[PDB]
Symmetry: C2
Subunit: 258 residues, 2 copies
């Protein structure tokens, strides 16, 4: 069998990623799939690329924040929107440690990929197969949008990230649709669930008979340490970051994730 | 931390249920939640009840197949309707081992209950809070209907069974909605997923911080042995049971 960790929406959250990788290592994970949104608005730059480099990452797709980073260091962002001025500052922060060539590598990733496990075809994308941004696939998204994940082209299981919520539901034709949630910026609309902001990821396990396990995991990490790191590093918008990690609130005029 | 196994839609599948329970034991499960649809149209009768009796069952709700059994043994079914003829024959098979008193106990179970883990409230029902049958919460179900699980009364996480598919989705207000799928009659609309008819169930784990794990599991079981059991015990509609366990068509 093959045990796969889905890593999504790290968003530069160094301590959360380190904790998730420690959890996956102890589970004997065989490979990693990277669903995108790797850097920003969190602390990690070189550290995150270094940590990912040590992994057997066998599948990687492009997140909207990779496009944002690329346009951001090319000064191609719309200055008139408050969220884009926030983003510009996060891009400058990243550029301090990450080279333009490395950002080119981040940008040059496919939107959608496919992998085969026996009888099963798995589709993989950050959001929609042809569109890594937007609100189409949120918790209340239209069924016809979900169906885009698993038809034209077809697959039996689709995995996506982007919305920062864990998920297991279906295409109209019964195809599985799963989401690991977010390692670094987990999102909850429910106030009681929002009290627990541990990292989200998931494990897929395939064997000779098919998909044997879908484990939606939560991983504790030292939030105090991540926040102290953000101070020490002069991370822009410390209070926005604090809010995201401690109270789980995100903002249209800051992150504008969706 | 507390580790809870959710058991649903056993539908008399003795061998599947034994394999799931062995899996849960090996995982060190602390308690079991039983979501209903215990007997029929599978092999198991006394053995299923004995298996369940050994379990620390901390939550239990009424499935529609419990009502169907109760109605069946009350001589209310009309065999001129094919679905009722089928059901009546399954009830006859159950009655060979299971007493009316035991059926009473199966039938006397609440439709919806709630359980508390620190800050989190969990709602539990077979299908809808006040309706354990129907198609409201199928995979393409209306959001309005899903929201019924987590509002009036409220909960933060709702668990249900009945549709025989594993699920993790949300109420409009972000409340979790989960489904372990079916132990004895796993259901797939997708023809490729249907090539794997291992038992379905799930584990929830709660700790001091909240909900730490939702593990949607598949458990291998000896289908041949279950079908051989069906032959030896003279189970009605063998060909229908065969198709359900081998090909997954209903
Ligand atoms: Fe993201
Ligand atoms: Fe059922
Ligand atoms: Mn995204
Ligand atoms: Mn049912």
């Amino acid at each position: 069998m093959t045990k796969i960790a889905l890593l999504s929406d790290i968003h530069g959250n160094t301590t959360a990623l380190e904790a998730v990788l420690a959890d996956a290592r102890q589970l004997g994970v065989d490979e990693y799939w990277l669903l995108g949104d790797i850097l920003m608005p969190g602390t990690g730059r070189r550290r995150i690329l270094d940590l990912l480099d040590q992994l057997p990452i066998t599948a990687r797709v492009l997140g909207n924040w990779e496009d944002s980073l690329w346009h951001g260091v090319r000064k191609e962002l719309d200055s008139t929107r408050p969220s884009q001025r926030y983003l510009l500052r996060q891009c400058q922060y990243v550029l301090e440690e990450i080279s333009l060539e490395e950002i080119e590598v981040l940008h040059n990733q496919p939107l959608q990929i496919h992998r085969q496990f026996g009888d099963l075809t798995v589709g993989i994308s950050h959001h929609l197969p042809d569109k890594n941004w937007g609100r189409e696939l949120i918790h209340t998204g239209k069924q016809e949008e979900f169906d885009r994940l698993v038809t034209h082209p077809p697959c039996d299981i689709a995995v996506y990230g982007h919305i920062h919520q864990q998920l297991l539901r279906y295409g109209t034709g019964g195809q599985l649709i799963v989401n690991p949630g977010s390692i670094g910026q987990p999102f909850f609309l429910d106030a009681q669930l929002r009290k627990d902001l541990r990292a989200q990821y998931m494990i897929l396990e395939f064997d000779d008979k098919g998909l044997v396990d879908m484990d939606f995991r939560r991983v504790d990490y030292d939030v105090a340490a991540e926040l102290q790191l953000a101070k020490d590093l002069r991370l822009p918008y410390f209070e926005v970051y604090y809010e995201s990690l401690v109270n789980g609130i995100h903002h249209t005029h800051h992150q504008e994730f969706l």
